[PDB]
Amino acid sequence: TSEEWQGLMQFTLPVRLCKEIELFHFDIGPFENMWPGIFVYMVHRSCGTSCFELEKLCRFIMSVKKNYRRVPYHNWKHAVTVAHCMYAILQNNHTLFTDLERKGLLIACLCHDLDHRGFSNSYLQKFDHPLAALYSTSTMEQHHFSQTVSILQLEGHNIFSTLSSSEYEQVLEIIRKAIIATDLALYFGNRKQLEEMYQTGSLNLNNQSHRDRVIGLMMTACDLCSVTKLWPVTKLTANDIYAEFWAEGDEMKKLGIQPIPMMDRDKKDEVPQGQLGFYNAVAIPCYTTLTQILPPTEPLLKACRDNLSQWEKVIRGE
Amino acid sequence: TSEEWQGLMQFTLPVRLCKEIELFHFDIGPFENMWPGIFVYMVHRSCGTSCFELEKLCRFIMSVKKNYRRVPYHNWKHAVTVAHCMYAILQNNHTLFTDLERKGLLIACLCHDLDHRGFSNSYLQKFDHPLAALYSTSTMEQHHFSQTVSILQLEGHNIFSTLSSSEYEQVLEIIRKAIIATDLALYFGNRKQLEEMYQTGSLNLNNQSHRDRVIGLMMTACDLCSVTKLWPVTKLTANDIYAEFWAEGDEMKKLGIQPIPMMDRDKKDEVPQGQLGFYNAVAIPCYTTLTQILPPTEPLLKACRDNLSQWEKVIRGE
Amino acid sequence: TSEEWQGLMQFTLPVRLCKEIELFHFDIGPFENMWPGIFVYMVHRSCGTSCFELEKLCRFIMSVKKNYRRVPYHNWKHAVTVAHCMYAILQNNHTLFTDLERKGLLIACLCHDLDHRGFSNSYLQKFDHPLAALYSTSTMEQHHFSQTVSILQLEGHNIFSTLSSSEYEQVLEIIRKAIIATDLALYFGNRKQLEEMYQTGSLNLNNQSHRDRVIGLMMTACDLCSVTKLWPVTKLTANDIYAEFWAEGDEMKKLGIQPIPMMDRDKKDEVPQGQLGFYNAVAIPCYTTLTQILPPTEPLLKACRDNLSQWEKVIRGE
Ligand SMILES: OCC1CCN(c2ncccc2Oc2ccc(Nc3nc4ccccc4[nH]3)cc2)CC1
Ligand SMILES: OCC1CCN(c2ncccc2Oc2ccc(Nc3nc4ccccc4[nH]3)cc2)CC1
Ligand SMILES: OCC1CCN(c2ncccc2Oc2ccc(Nc3nc4ccccc4[nH]3)cc2)CC1
Ligand SMILES: [Zn+2]
Ligand SMILES: [Zn+2]
Ligand SMILES: [Zn+2]
Ligand SMILES: [Zn+2]
Ligand SMILES: [Zn+2]
Ligand SMILES: [Zn+2]
């Protein structure tokens, strides 16, 4: 049978990639046509060779790719990068997650920014974009999930067709919650709740609502993982995100609205302090809380701390 | 019938767009996939819901889009922007124009820079491009019109198929003259003639040759309308046009010809004075004459004057 | 017959192009859709109107184009530029080369960088790219040749189908050797051998191994021909190559490897001295040796010398 022949197959990467893909700070490289293979490899190792039908998975992956846009940061490379961080979390906490969760979370990460235009929820609201009329909150994130379902609905694209309806409904809910959780506006309340539950000892991974919250934080951690890379990667990637943000600031000015310094290219000089503030207020607390809940995710926090030190070095003119 | 069902249809934009599209200084925004709908809306309001068969118009619009190139300024965004300025002129002088003219002029504006390479007529002549051998004068503009006719000749693309042959010939002549008029070399003589006829009182919109001249000036006014936007739009758009011009200057240098300061990136510092000179010699006289002939086009002149003041502020180092 | 109708055909370029295409320092221009015609013209003049079936050649050319990538330097424009330099060498040494060699070398030049990613052999090795596992030496160059053969194997793409098998095997060997010779690592040993054989008088174009070496040097000369253009062309093209090199340097830093100053954008200021060193160590000796072997290639050396002077002028701050 087809599933039998698939069980005999072994998917391998080049030697350096096989070794370094296990590291949290792995960078996927500039060879775009290797990314699909990298994702398949990760799915194989974290889920199993029989989790997805290979032909369907490849078809799905290429369609997801086609539905990411040629924008500076929120692109296909970001999608695979976020997926890899999830892989590393899964592999280092392999005891904790079900079959459905491993399937669902890697797919959720790959799909989490589908059809991103390089503009924030705030801008879409102020422009009065049709998406903002349909989705009052988490505008882009609800769209990302809608795009995911649409791709799954294409002929030969349902990678979950081997699942029972019950399991299918569960995995789609996992994916939905995970993608919505990438709305950074929702992160602040989520992390606060998680910190409180952790300190009191009420936090319980057997409780579905608590489990959803931890998955949420994992999604934030993966989404921001560019700050957990080695310095050259982190610093160069910052150029990409600011390219998007400054373009949005330009568009804000065209609406006759003064953008916040973050989106304003005239405030270029304040970038190092802006990043410092972001690490202090968002990135460090995220990875700190994550490391408390899932201790094997410690390398993410260490690398984030190292990058904070690098930004401090930039500020001092050193 | 199909035309009956179309009469029942109402095309609407988002609230902010419905309001602000009526303003001369409206900016069409960064969401490319909304531009076709914006054009259809404008056609509906200025011409009527029964002017074009919707299916044919949409097919036409997408083919026009496909025949604009990925250049910094003379692109699809410019085409829709010029079309919008015409819409605003038409709507504020709604009493003056025939059914054919409203149809023709919006289409002419949409098509007026079709297949632009980002190079001037001068460069094509000096390179010895095949187009310069075919069209001795108004080289690119004659090509733009040729492209328009070719698109109209495609199966299911004749948006004027409901017209009599007589009316079809008239609308094509309207379009031809309008597109040729966008050759800025022809603007100077046209505006001079118009000014003289206006001051003596010989100018008569019932005279076809006079009417052609006024339409010509309207085309210049729409073509240059980026100078009639709010300052942030006008200033940022200047970056796009200079990207094209400097690339042409580079190509001139490659032919062993010293380009004029306008096309020379080494003369970056002279941009503010260059713009001032352009507003004084071209833009202000254009909108001044247009406002004299068509008083409701006054906001274009006011906004142009405001931008002149902004360039003066740049020059002073303020 | 078809070949009879082809014999009656005359392919012509615009007047300026017909004249200036014969000059070594000709630049192919910014009009991409003219490059195929320029190549066909060159094939017609250097080989003959009956060398290739026109329909097949056009199909081949467009497929080659499609297999070059949108990178700053190693692109479709580079391919045609290298092909033109070969044309000029062939036309000025028209007595020396066989029918097969003229066919083969123009095609080899057009195909010599097929599917280039904008990264060096060194980077592919350090990344551990699958291509480096397949080709231990001349990694990209072996791939370029593999791509060439694959394109030739496509239905209706075998431009050599009129050749006997013996002649087909010969032309493919000519192409293979020529493309491999564009590996600059191999140039140093080749030029040294050629210089020694020239000075002793052992160099003999009737000896196949010697002939292969001279063709090799011709390939290096064509590959580097951007340094033999007029100053504005040479200087602007330098921007393109450094865009690629600096991107590679970025990627090196992402691997945790300090790149050499050549690939490091932080060493921007050292570009003029870097170019001077390159002209001294590589470019001048290449064209010097080539001019010794083939005296009519003298203009390449003169133009290279002129550009060396220009870089010296940059260094002095003049
Ligand atoms: O190192 C690359 C990563 C940096 C953080 N990344 C972000 N992810 C999600 C949202 C925003 C991200 O980047 C930021 C975060 C904070 C800022 N804050 C900020 N405030 C500023 C004030 C003045 C000037 C610049 C400023 N940047 C800017 C960009 C992803 C890529
Ligand atoms: O604000 C954006 C609009 C500016 C005017 N636009 C033009 N439209 C048609 C032709 C030329 C346009 O832009 C100009 C106009 C005049 C100049 N003149 C000029 N002379 C210069 C001398 C030295 C240095 C720069 C110079 N620019 C440059 C660009 C469209 C976009
Ligand atoms: O003028 C345009 C041509 C310049 C030479 N070109 C090259 N072709 C093949 C390989 C490398 C080419 O460009 C070079 C050659 C040498 C260098 N060397 C160099 N060393 C440097 C040290 C510090 C800073 C910059 C440096 N560049 C850089 C680029 C093609 C385009
Ligand atoms: Zn997102
Ligand atoms: Zn994201
Ligand atoms: Zn034009
Ligand atoms: Zn225009
Ligand atoms: Zn090469
Ligand atoms: Zn090359």
Q: Say if residue C9 is exposed, middle or buried (CB neighbours under 10 Å; 0-12, 13-18, 19+).
A: exposed
Residues A156, A154: Cα–Cα separation, whole Å: 6
Tokens 């990178």 appear where? Answer: C71
User: Was A128 annotated as part of a binding site?
Assistant: no
Q: Which is nearest to C120 in space by CA: C282, C280, C262?
A: C262
User: Phi first, then psi: what are they for A27, rounded to 5°?
Assistant: -110, 135
Q: Which residues contact A173 (CB under 8 A, 6 or more apart)?
A: none
Do the chains contact at C251 and A31, CB–CB below 8 Å? no
Structure tokens that stand for C277 in this block:
């060193």
Q: Is the separation of the CB atoms in A178 and A148 below 8 Å?
A: no
List the resolution, Å.
Answer: 2.0
Cβ-contact A304, A228 below 8 angstroms: yes
Q: CA of C124: which chain A residue's CA is closest?
A: A31
Q: Is residue A75 a contact partner of residue A119, using CB atoms and an 8 Å limit?
A: no
How far is B105 from B221, CA to CA, in rounded Å?
13
The one-letter amino acid code at C285 reads: P
Phi and psi angles of residue C74, each rounded to the nearest 5 degrees, phi first? -80, 60
**Of the candidates A241, A251, A280, A249, the residue with the CA atom closest to the CA atom of residue A267:** A249
Rounded to the nearest angstrom, the distance between the alpha carbon of B115 and the centre of ligand 7 is 11
A306-311 contacts, C-beta under 8 A, 24 or more apart: A306/A231, A307/A227, A307/A228, A307/A229, A307/A231, A307/A234, A307/A279, A308/A276, A308/A279, A308/A280, A308/A283, A308/A284, A310/A231, A310/A234, A310/A235, A311/A272, A311/A275, A311/A276, A311/A279
Q: For residue B109, which of B159, B175, B55 has the smallest C-alpha distance? A: B175
What's the 3-state SS for B29-55?
A: CCCHHHHHHHHHHHHHHHCCCCCCCHH
Pick from B17, B93, B9, B87: which is nearest to B45 by CA?
Answer: B87
User: How far is Cα A65 from Cα A157, in angstroms, rounded to an integer?
Assistant: 13
Please give the Cα distance from C258 to C262 (Å, whole number).
11
Identity of the amino acid at C100? L
Alpha-carbon distance of B300 to A113, in angstroms, equals 41
Write out the two tokens for A107: 């797919």
* Of C302, C299, C286, residue with least CA distance to C92: C299
SS3 content of chain B, % helix, strand, coil (to 5): 70, 0, 30
Q: How far apart are CA B12 and CA B37, in angstroms?
A: 9
C→A interface, C-beta within 8 Å: 117, 119, 127-130, 133, 247, 250-251, 253-256
As a whole number of angstroms, the distance between CA C52 and CA B140 comes to 35
Q: What CA–CA distance (Å, rounded) separates C102 from B12?
A: 64
Q: Which two tokens stand for residue A69?
A: 């846009």
Of residues B68, B58, B35, the one with CA closest to residue B143: B68
**Burial environment of residue B288 by CB neighbours within 10 A (0 to 12, 13 to 18, 19 or more):** middle
Burial B249-261 (b: 16+ CB within 10 A, else e): bbbbbbbeeebee
A121, A143, B20, C226, C313 from A136: Cα distances, Å:
10, 11, 22, 56, 62
- Find the radius of gyration of the CA atoms of chain C: 20
Fold observed for domain C1-318: Catalytic domain of cyclic nucleotide phosphodiesterase 4b2b (1.10.1300)
* B neighbour chains, 3+ CB pairs within 8 Å: A, C
Task: Please list, in sequence order, all residues whose beta carbon lies within 8 angstroms of the beta carbon of residue A266, skipping any fewer than 6 positions away.
Answer: none
Calpha distance B61→B58 (Å, rounded) = 5
Give the whole-angstrom CA distance, residue C318 versus residue C316.
5
- 3-class secondary structure, C264: coil
Secondary structure letter of residue A192 according to DSSP: H
Active-site residue, from C25, C44, C74, C157: C74
Provide residues of A within 8 Å CB-CB of chain B: 117, 119, 127-130, 133, 247, 250-251, 253-256
Assign B1 to helix, strand or coil: coil
Q: Where are the domains of chain C?
A: 1-318
Q: Angle of helix B165-181 relative to helix B208-223, nearest 10 degrees? A: 50
Place of tokens 């693309």: B157
Count CB atoms within 10 A of the CB of residue B100: 17
Helix (H) or strand (E) holding B239: helix B231-254
List, as residue ranges, the binding site of B for a divalent metal cation: 78, 112-113, 223
Say how far apart CA B271 and CA B88 lie, in whole Å.
Answer: 30
Owner of token pair 């030496």: C137
DSSP letter (8 states) at residue C79:
H
Alpha-carbon distance of B228 to B244, in angstroms, equals 20
Tally of CB atoms within 10 A around B232 = 19
The per-residue b/e assignment along C270-302, b for 16 or more CB within 10 angstroms, e otherwise, is: ebbebbeebbeebbbbbbebbbebbeebebbbe
**Which structure tokens are listed for B231?**
């300052």
Structural method: X-ray
Residues 6+ apart with CB under 8 A from A196: none
Q: Is C74 a catalytic residue?
A: yes
| DSSP state string for A205-227 | TTSHHHHHHHHHHHHHHHHTGGG
**Structure-block tokens of residue C129:** 């790219």
* CA max distance for chain A: 64
The structure tokens 């097949």 sit at C56
